[PDB]
Amino acid sequence: ARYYVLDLSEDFRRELRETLAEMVNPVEVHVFLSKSGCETCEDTLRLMKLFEEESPTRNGGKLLKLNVYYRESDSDKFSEFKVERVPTVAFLGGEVRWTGIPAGEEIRALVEVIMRLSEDESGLEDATKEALKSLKGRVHIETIITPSCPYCPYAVLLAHMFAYEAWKQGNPVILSEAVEAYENPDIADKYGVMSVPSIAINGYLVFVGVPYEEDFLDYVKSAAEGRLTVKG
């Protein structure tokens, strides 16, 4: 593709391996692809195979456990994780995912998500964690991004951590999806996205840019209750 430069060099592998060397607990990642009709799937697999390879190995166990699924032979898995589009890179039960290759600047958010899940720590504020525990109502976060986008990683990280925090507390009502615009132009145009990152929640554009955690919590709570709040 023309919108991202996949770096599988030894230099990157070295840098990645060094960061992942600090992983605490193992993390499973689920990659959904299609044998055909998916231009970026091959690259996504190369990228994710690289991540798995560079993750630490402790007692024959790779700290990053890669699972790869194809639309055809893995139909039930797609249904289980509620994956309709490919390529998709998901964690948990699919509540944290990238719909579209997490290349370019997204590598930063992908690494951080892996690290935080590994550390059993979302890194969110206590107030946020407490709110997510009891949050009622489903929340579908779509953070529209592109691989080259410099600030997207921060927005993606935030939404993903919200989904993770809720999920780890046994309240998986949040689906945080990082939607790569080039592979999913319809979603980007559904929200009239002019600049990335842009964030939609429950089918409506909610924020343009990277929001503050505390503010995002308000957006999430309001979305859950089907209400509109001020970016304020």
Ligand SMILES: [Cl-]
């Ligand atoms: Cl397939």
